[PDB]
Amino acid sequence: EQPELEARVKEIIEVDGYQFRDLNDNGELDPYEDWRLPTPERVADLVGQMSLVEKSGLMLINTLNAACDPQTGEFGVLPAQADNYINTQHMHRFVFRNVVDVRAEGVECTGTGTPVVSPAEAATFTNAVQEMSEATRLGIPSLFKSNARNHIDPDARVGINEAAGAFSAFPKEAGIAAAALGEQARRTGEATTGDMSVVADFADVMGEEWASIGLRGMYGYMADLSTEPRWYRTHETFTEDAYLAAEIMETLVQTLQGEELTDNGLALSPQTRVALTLKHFPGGGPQELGLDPHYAFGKAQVYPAGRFEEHFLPFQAAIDAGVSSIMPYYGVPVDVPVVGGEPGETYPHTGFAFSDSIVNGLLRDQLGFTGYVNSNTGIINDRAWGLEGNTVPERVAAAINGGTDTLSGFSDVSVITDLYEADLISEERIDLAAERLLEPLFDMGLFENPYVDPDVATATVGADDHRAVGLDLQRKSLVLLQNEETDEGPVLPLKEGGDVYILGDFTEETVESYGYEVTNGNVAEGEERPSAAGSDYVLISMTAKTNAGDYVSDDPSLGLNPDHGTNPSVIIGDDGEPLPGLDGQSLWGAADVCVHKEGHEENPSCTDNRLRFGGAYPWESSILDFTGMEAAESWEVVPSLETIQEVMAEVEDPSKVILHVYFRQPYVLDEESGLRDAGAILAGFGMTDTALMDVLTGAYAPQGKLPFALAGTREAIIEQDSDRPGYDETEDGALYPFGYGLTYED
Ligand SMILES: [Zn+2]
Ligand SMILES: [Zn+2]
Ligand SMILES: [Zn+2]
Ligand SMILES: [Zn+2]
Ligand SMILES: [Zn+2]
Ligand SMILES: [Zn+2]
Ligand SMILES: [Zn+2]
Ligand SMILES: [Zn+2]
Ligand SMILES: [Zn+2]
Ligand SMILES: [Zn+2]
Ligand SMILES: [Zn+2]
Ligand SMILES: [Zn+2]
Ligand SMILES: [Zn+2]
Ligand SMILES: [Zn+2]
Secondary structure (H helix, E strand, C coil): CCCCCCCCCCEEEEECCEEEEECCCCCCCCHHHCCCCCHHHHHHHHHHHCCHHHHHHCCEEEECCCEEECCCCEEEECCCHHHHHHHHCCCCEEECCCCECCCCCCCCCCCCCCCCECHHHHHHHHHHHHHHHHCCCCCCCCEEECCCCCECCCCCCCCCCCCCCCCCCECCHHHHHHHHHHHHHHHHCCCCCCCCHHHHHHHHHHHHHHHHCCCCEEEEEECCCCCCCCCHHHHHCCCCCHHHHHHHHHHHHHHHHCCCCCCCCCCCCCCCCCEEEEEEECCCCCEHHHCCCCCHHHCEECCCCCCHHHHCHHHHHHHHCCCCEEEECCCEECCCECCCCCCCCECCCCCHHHCHHHHHHHHHHHCCCCCEEECCCCCCCCCCCCCCCCCHHHHHHHHHHCCCCEEECCCCCHHHHHHHHCCCCCHHHHHHHHHHHHHHHHHCCCCCCCCCCHHHHHHHCCCHHHHHHHHHHHHHHCEEEEECEECCEECCCCCCCCEEEEECCCCHHHHHCCCCEEEECCCCCCCCCCCCCCCCEEEEEEEEEECCCCCCCCCCCCCCCHHHCCECCEEECCCCCEEEEEECCECHHHHCHHHHCCCCCCCCCCCCHHHCCCCCCHHHCCCCEHHHHHHCCCEEEECCHHHHHHHHHHCCCHHHEEEEEECCCCCECCCCCCHHHCCEEEECCCCCHHHHHHHHCCCCCCCCCCCCCEECCHHHHHHCCCCCCCCCCCCCCEEECCCCCECCCC
16 A cells, blocks of 8 residues: 655655655645545646646656766766756656667767766666656656667667667567567468567566666657658558557557556556657558658648548557557648548648647547647647648647647747737646646656666666567568579578678678678778679678758759659648648749748748758659669668679679668669569568578578568559558559568478
8 A cells, every 4th residue: 555655855744654745845745645545636636736837837848868067977967957947947748868878988978969878877867857856846756758769770780789788679660560470470370460479578678678767758659550651750660550550559558558547547557667658640651642741841641542540540549558648740631531520521731730620629539538648849830730820829829729738849838828828728728738747647656756776777778688588579570571492492591601792781790600701892982892703692781761961942953943843742721722832733842931931930941951850852752662762862772772783793693692671661672673683582670680690590580571561663652542551552563462471491
């Protein structure tokens, strides 16, 4: 019965043979401090005791990184704006964005940048914040959220962490789904919804580790579906399939949040290791032409196969399991029938984050949701699609009244009060937000004990057993797409010994240690590449990435160059008039406010410039084939297809070539490229070379299955339905279907 308490500022008081934390220092025990009451009473006691500014401070969530003092050499101390946020803005929600790792030899505090922090330093920092948060008048604790931390960067495989001090490395989201499908297939012969014991294994490690540093919240995971392969965010999606996606969100929510649901229907208890903020509701996947609504040319989400409801299925599974919070997306649902509405009705052509239809209607009224909504970061001011002319206060008001409870990237309470004083937001609405936002903190036990032992984080983050679990999923995520049968047998597994030529991110000594003489075809562009003739095997680690850093919306060379074509997207506004740039006939940069200059500001800045969040030049977003990407402006194939093609010809039989492809997006192995001529082709999703060599040499056999289908032609890419998985409705069809994957047979 008696909860474990820890108080660092306020004092512990006894009542009825029990201890409680006197958070408001009034000397006696308030209901909101009485852990014996149900949470609805503790919230009501607390909301009533709260000033309006304090209640408004709960509607703010912004970055609060750990810092280092350049004068003590101590890492993981409070940053500068910490005092402000907690004591002045009364914030209690932050995003923690330091890399947690063991710092290199010789790394000092630069006073600038975001320092890498150790597990014990990170927890010392979050503890420091909780101690400050406890010094507040009422003493409300803080909650930290963060983006994913346990996934390998398939672009930085050399520095994958194989030691303690860093979060255990697992494959990317899709690789986890690849492992779950392959583990189901291995056990049953079916590859449909997956074997979620994999997902629970991963999520159980992520939970212990995140919790051990006092990071009890997540911006994620992503429930978006990779139904549109030209979307650049497919690298953070688990699958294209809504059903597998739904089973994964369920398991994630159960594992990370717990299976004990409150009366309010939320998986929130003191054993809740990480409360999820699932994103991006009601599904961010079906982007028209794959263009992302971070950008003015990409505001549109279209549903040609009428799958709006499938895309939010994973969200309903997570809601039903009790997901704590939801973040909407900022794309615009184009001509989408209202769920549960009367015939002919469609959702407003406004960004989801501003539609009461979507965040109050669909989310809370049609689906079960009973938690709080967290907005996206950096969208209110510059990306309130369908509200171009509105002022910034009008936009914040729209999102708030539309159902958003806390504002991401916001750290000035004045904003909320200014809108309340301007009568665009009721104090009733504020109180509602405050009740939704305090509920998890009570239920998670942060009002009794919000601290962590930093010595224990050291022993937890990247423990040997956690890393082993990570490495298990790494090996199970590898999908073997092609394995030629030669006269002497199948290309994989490799024979013992031999001369190996490597191209791409490969750790030579790791490959060498499996018993191979290795030649390294990786040379600085000045130096000369050794030839691959006479190699017994060729290992190529390839991917594709965008170099669109040069895009500018209003330059007639790029964004406004008629030679680049027109934006086919059409979004008819509220009024019956097309949105600027989105009439179907406009130049690509035409939708950027720096062009149409709509809004209460005369000289706005380009919102799309540099394409900083990712994605190709919009006129190049369908170039997903490797021959096309080689020749494109904003696409780079790594290593160059020129070099890979030179190499596959220096070698006698292209059957000795083994391609390890990171399909960051569903890239197309076009016939012209010649890659299909490789003897073996694998889709990798983030693994160490130990994991890769373990499979390639036959210590373990491949068993992953594709969590999304791959096309063989660019036409299939243009024709597929942005909201529909696979390529079966296209004239060329799939190269490999969803759920495909070979294994060895001896
Ligand atoms: Zn009593
Ligand atoms: Zn009290
Ligand atoms: Zn406060
Ligand atoms: Zn189920
Ligand atoms: Zn202010
Ligand atoms: Zn101790
Ligand atoms: Zn453990
Ligand atoms: Zn060597
Ligand atoms: Zn030799
Ligand atoms: Zn051009
Ligand atoms: Zn051959
Ligand atoms: Zn060829
Ligand atoms: Zn054709
Ligand atoms: Zn599709």
